[PDB]
């Protein structure tokens, strides 16, 4: 029974969707606390070193971050272990590359290059409405951001559009049947579909049923259902519109690419 909090992370005990190599080393980076937690995030160095290949070692990534060449929602971050999460903005001005962090059909993080018209905001999921000091209403989001004095019409599990420049709401999407959603956890991560039923069980989890555009149907709990607009997506999405292929189709694709 450890006397205090943990600071290390063994490579084998790291999350699977990070795709770390077994023999790369004994250790893995331990993300620091921030907007996203350990199991729904990814350290900055992994993106800067094992994905874009701009750096070959820890020291290069540290130097780059100190030089303040990377922006995360308009605020330069110098922490090599800063956690990056879903619906983030990842812009590198010195190479005119701007990406949005999303989930692929396989259930992994991806960078979707975006335009300037939609790179000044982000979508947030509201999880809690509480009264703070002096009875002032508040709200919290999945990225650990608190807003004061919100519109009464906003309820839990809704989606919020906040401008990055200032940090103010402009519009919100209600949680209802017939609204396009994206799955952010479980066996169905990265899929896109439309809500068709909402079944609530007293004292336990609420289940959400959605249908894929092709006609497929799948189930998931409400804790990882993310509205990304009405009917049509508000933001850009990867090339494939959240359609998971079968093993046979994936094998055909692999053989074609070989």
């Amino acid at each position: 029974m450890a006397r205090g909090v943990r600071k290390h992370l063994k490579r084998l005990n790291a999350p699977k969707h990070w795709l770390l190599d077994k023999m790369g080393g004994i250790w893995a980076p331990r993300p620091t606390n921030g907007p996203h937690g350990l199991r729904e995030c990814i350290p900055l160095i992994l993106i800067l070193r094992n994905r874009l290949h701009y750096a070959n070692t820890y020291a290069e990534t540290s130097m780059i971050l100190q030089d303040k060449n990377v922006l995360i929602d308009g605020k330069p971050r110098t922490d090599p272990t800063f956690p990056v999460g879903f619906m983030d903005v990842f812009e590198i001005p010195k190479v005119h590359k701007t990406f949005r962090v999303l989930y692929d059909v396989k259930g992994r993080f991806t960078l979707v290059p975006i335009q300037s018209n939609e790179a000044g905001f982000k979508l947030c999921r509201v999880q809690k409405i509480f009264l703070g000091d002096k009875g002032m209403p508040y709200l919290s989001t999945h990225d650990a951001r608190t807003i004061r004095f919100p519109h009464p019409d906003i309820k839990t599990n809704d989606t919020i559009k906040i401008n990055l420049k200032t940090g103010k709401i402009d519009e919100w999407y209600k949680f209802d049947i017939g609204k396009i959603v994206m799955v952010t956890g479980g066996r169905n991560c990265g899929r896109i579909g439309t809500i068709q039923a909402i079944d609530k069980h007293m004292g336990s989890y609420t289940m959400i049923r959605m249908k894929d555009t092709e006609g497929t149907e799948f189930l998931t709990r409400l804790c990882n259902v993310f509205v990304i607009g009405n009917d049509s997506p508000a933001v850009a999405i990867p090339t494939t519109k959240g359609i998971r292929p079968d093993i046979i189709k994936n094998r055909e694709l692999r053989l074609r690419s070989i």
Binding site: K22, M23, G25, I26, D246, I247, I248, R251
Partner: protein
């Protein structure tokens, strides 16, 4: 601990349960002579591979034809066999696999493929030249007698350009 602890490892052959059996000894010596086998471990390796293929084929055959897993695994196995030249091209049904024999495995060894091309006098001569790096596959030279050639690579086997 050391990263070397996570490396995998395994044996590659099976020994007979009954060692002394006259027909088995005769057959093994016969095969060793025809294919110039260094020792009796190669036969055990061939038996191991054949057993693996046979078990996979059995497990797949126990199921219905229109089973997604059956189609997937049968297609993979047949493609592998066709690419490796163990099974003939015209055979595409899973049943033909269970009748295979280790002679088919042996016939695709490098010594055999160079001997059938008339490039060597005998299997022993082939082994002697192979050990002396005088042969090449495609653009690369291979000095392992047990190296297995693929069907698309059979016609690209030649004598090493740098060989004297």
């Amino acid at each position: 601990p050391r990263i070397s602890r996570h490396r995998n490892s395994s044996k590659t052959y099976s020994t007979p349960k009954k060692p002394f059996t006259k027909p088995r000894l005769d057959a093994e010596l016969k095969l060793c002579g025809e294919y110039g086998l260094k020792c009796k471990r190669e036969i055990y390796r061939a038996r191991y591979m054949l057993a693996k293929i046979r078990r996979t084929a059995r497990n797949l055959l126990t199921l219905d034809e229109n089973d997604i897993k059956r189609r997937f695994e049968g297609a993979a196995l047949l493609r592998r066999l066709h690419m490796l030249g163990i099974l003939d091209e015209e055979k595409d049904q899973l049943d033909y696999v269970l009748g295979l024999r280790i002679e088919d495995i042996f016939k695709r060894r490098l010594q055999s493929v160079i001997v059938e091309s008339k490039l060597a006098k005998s299997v022993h001569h082939a082994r002697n030249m192979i050990k002396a790096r005088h042969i090449s596959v495609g653009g690369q030279i291979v000095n392992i007698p047990s190296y297995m050639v693929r069907i698309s690579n059979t016609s690209r086997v030649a004598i090493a350009d740098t060989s004297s």
